[PDB]
Structure 1
Amino acid sequence: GAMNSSNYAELFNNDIKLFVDDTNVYRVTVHKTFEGNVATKAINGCIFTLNPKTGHLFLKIIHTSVWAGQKRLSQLAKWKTAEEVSALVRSLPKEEQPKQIIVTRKAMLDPLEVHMLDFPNIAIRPTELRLPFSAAMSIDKLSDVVMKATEPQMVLFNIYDDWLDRISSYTAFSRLTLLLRALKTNEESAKMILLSDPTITIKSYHLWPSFTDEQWITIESQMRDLILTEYGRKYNV
């Protein structure tokens, strides 16, 4: 059924699975019109589809032209997500197709199940985890490629860089969610943490900085402090 704390290690077994997050598919800026009414202007979006075992990120960029002349965009966005995920599975060789697709919001279940009727043996699942994938646009290299796109476009990233050379998937996933949780709670502080020391750089071919094991422990500690802090500043404790 749903995915939660009790079955957490299933993410890192050898059954191919994808997380799909739709929270940045339809993005808008709300503004005032000359008449003093309110209007929205859409900006480019993305589907965040992630293999938590390997780090492969299928970032499907959603160009604002896909909304032109459409109604009920929030609802259409779920179906467009589903249509693009289904197109991706079909593009993958059989032995690469996921056995399960986990959606980070339940409103995606029906749109995805309908689009994947041709794949009766792929399980579509929800999750009880509150995953911070909406913060994926706080990663500079991903935001940049999304905002620059002039047409629909898929770019294939590895969200873990080469961490899997040194750490297991479970630990890599835990680092990733701690980084994203931090960027979602206080983006400026989080980014300050990751880039204060000019001697640690982001490789041209890497999303995140080149931290040693020791520096990563320091970093990870600093992000937990941030998340507990902001939880005080927010709740006054």
Structure 2
Amino acid sequence: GAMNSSNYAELFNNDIKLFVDDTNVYRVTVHKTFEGNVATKAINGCIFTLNPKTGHLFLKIIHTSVWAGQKRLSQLAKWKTAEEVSALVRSLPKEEQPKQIIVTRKAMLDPLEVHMLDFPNIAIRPTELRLPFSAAMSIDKLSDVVMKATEPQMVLFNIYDDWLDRISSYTAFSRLTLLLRALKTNEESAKMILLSDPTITIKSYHLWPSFTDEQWITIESQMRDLILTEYGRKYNV
């Protein structure tokens, strides 16, 4: 069924699974027309499809042209998402196909279930976790590839850089989610934390700085402080 804190280690077992987040698939700016009306202009979006065990991110870039001439775009975004995810699975060798796809919003369940009726042995599940994957566009290199795309495009990343050489999947997922939570709550401070030291660099083939283990502990603590605090400045406590 659904996914919550009670079956949390399941993410890191040896059944292939992906999260699918659609919160950045349809993105708009809202602006005033010459007539003083309001209108939306769409910008490029992305499907955030993530193996939580390997860190492999299938980042399907959603180019604005996919919306041209279409109505009910929030509803189509969910069906577009499910079409792209279905196509993704179909392109993987059987032994690479997920046994489960977990959607981060319940409104993706029916669009994905329908697009995957071909795949009865793939379980489509919601989750009760409030995962911060929407902040994925606060990762500079991801944001950069989305905004520069001139056509539909799929780009592959390892959202964990090389961490799995030193830590477990569980721990790496916990680090990613703390970093994304931090970026979602206060992007500026989160980003100040990550780069406050000019001697720590982001390797060309990575998304996050090259922190040592001890530096990661300091960072992780600082991010916790941020999340605690902003939650202070938010509920005045």
TM > 0.5 fold call: yes
- Give how far 1:168 is off: 0.1
Q: Which residue of 2 aligns with 1:134?
A: 134
- Give how far 1:52 is off: 0.1
In 2: Cα distance, 1:162 partner to 1:233 partner? 35
- Give how far 1:88 is off: 0.2
Corresponding residue pairs, total: 237
- Give how far 1:135 is off: 0.1
SS at match of 2:8: helix
Identical positions, percent:
100
Q: Which residue of 1 aligns with 2:90?
A: 90
- Give how far 1:156 is off: 0.6
Q: Which residue of 1 aligns with 2:145?
A: 145
- Give how far 1:31 is off: 0.2
In 2: Cα distance, 1:202 partner to 1:5 partner? 32
In 1: Cα distance, 2:165 partner to 2:157 partner? 16
In 1: Cα distance, 2:224 partner to 2:84 partner? 35
In 2: Cα distance, 1:231 partner to 1:137 partner? 22
- Give how far 1:212 is off: 0.3
- Give how far 1:33 is off: 0.3
SS at match of 1:190: helix
- Give how far 1:160 is off: 0.1
- Give how far 1:203 is off: 0.3
In 2: Cα distance, 1:196 partner to 1:218 partner? 12
In 2: Cα distance, 1:162 partner to 1:146 partner? 23
- Give how far 1:80 is off: 0.1
- Give how far 1:20 is off: 0.1
- Give how far 1:155 is off: 0.2
- Give how far 1:23 is off: 0.1
In 2: Cα distance, 1:206 partner to 1:119 partner? 34
Q: Residue deviations 1:14-46, cap 9 Å, x none? A: 000000000000000000000000000000000
Q: Which residue of 2 aligns with 1:45?
A: 45
Is 1:62 paired with 2:62?
yes
Q: Residue deviations 1:124-168, cap 9 Å, x none? A: 000000000000000000000000000000001000000000000
Q: TM-score, normalised by structure 2?
A: 1.00
Q: Which consecutive unaligned segments of at least 5 residues does structure 2 have?
A: none
SS at match of 1:112: helix
SS at match of 1:102: strand
In 2: Cα distance, 1:29 partner to 1:156 partner? 27
- Give how far 1:187 is off: 0.1
- Give how far 1:170 is off: 0.2
- Give how far 1:209 is off: 0.1
- Give how far 1:213 is off: 0.2
SS at match of 1:226: helix
In 2: Cα distance, 1:35 partner to 1:145 partner? 34
- Give how far 1:54 is off: 0.1
Q: Which consecutive unaligned segments of at least 5 residues does structure 1 have?
A: none
Q: Residue deviations 1:49-106, cap 9 Å, x none? A: 0000000000000000000000000000000000000000000000000000000000
- Give how far 1:173 is off: 0.1
In 2: Cα distance, 1:192 partner to 1:208 partner? 13
In 2: Cα distance, 1:183 partner to 1:194 partner? 10
Q: TM-score, normalised by structure 1?
A: 1.00
In 2: Cα distance, 1:35 partner to 1:146 partner? 31
Q: Which residue of 2 aligns with 1:159?
A: 159
